[model samples]
Target: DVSGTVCLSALPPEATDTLNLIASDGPFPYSQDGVVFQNRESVLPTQSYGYYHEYTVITPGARTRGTRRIITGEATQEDYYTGDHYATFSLIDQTC
Candidate 1:
């Protein structure tokens, strides 16, 4: 996991769970969990349309899945997390 810049501990438990799911070929909770992330907003580093995939970060007590999301980029499998509906992102360093 250390192959990236952001540390694993910096992410929330829900994010980690999603990461685990991704690693394990998950039976993800949401239908859209493994959907291609179209980075049209250009928040993350530029790449091909299919270079990134998205997963949800479940928000407790919320009627829906909430705004939190974990986006994984290709090549390095680098993780980027967005808590504000893709308004901003923090590169997740899972290098531990």
Candidate 2:
């Protein structure tokens, strides 16, 4: 029923208690993969599973040049994952 403004408190208290706002009001829809919840390196699944892939405009290696890969996954060499709760993945971003 959230055409616009869904009361996020609708989530259970346990869920809200652990909630941390990544983007309070992102223009992307609530399920648009706007934020990565929980710690990327901590022992847990990054998300509960949903639309998870976006075709990058740049080729795979194209973006890695001159960038710092922060959070490395369990499978950095193979670059694959079984999506287990504790399995890891790397976070990469360009440094200034």
Candidate 3:
């Protein structure tokens, strides 16, 4: 149900970095990088558990993990970026 899309390069610097980490199946910088996203807010299309995973986008100078995140999904290999926690999302267009 996302109306807008952003090319990978267009996302925040931290988001692009996180995307790369996700691609490599990484030794991520944050412990919470690869966990199932519950989609409890129901903003995205409904999906079963394990279908979606969330990654943290580091916020420079923050004492703890920030609200930004990159959410990756299976099958379609689709990805989403949420700058304000899960309040809104934008499709990540990797084709760029």
> What clash count does candidate 1 reach?
6
Tens digits of lDDT, candidate 3, 13-72: 777777788888887888767688767767777578777888877778767777777777
The alpha-carbon RMSD values of the candidates against the true structure, listed in the order shown, are 3.7, 16.7, 1.8
Model 3 residue 53 CA deviation in Å = 0.7
Best by TM-score: 3
Q: State the lDDT at 41 in candidate 1.
A: 73
lDDT of 1 by residue, 1-96 (tens): 122355678777777877887888697877647777878777678558798888877667757777887787775566677777776677776675
Clashes (N, CA, C under 3 Å) per candidate: 6, 3, 0
The TM-score values for the models, in the order shown, are: 0.81, 0.18, 0.84
Candidate 1: residue pairs that collide = 1-94, 2-95, 5-93, 6-92, 6-93, 7-93
Global Cα lDDT for candidate 2: 0.24
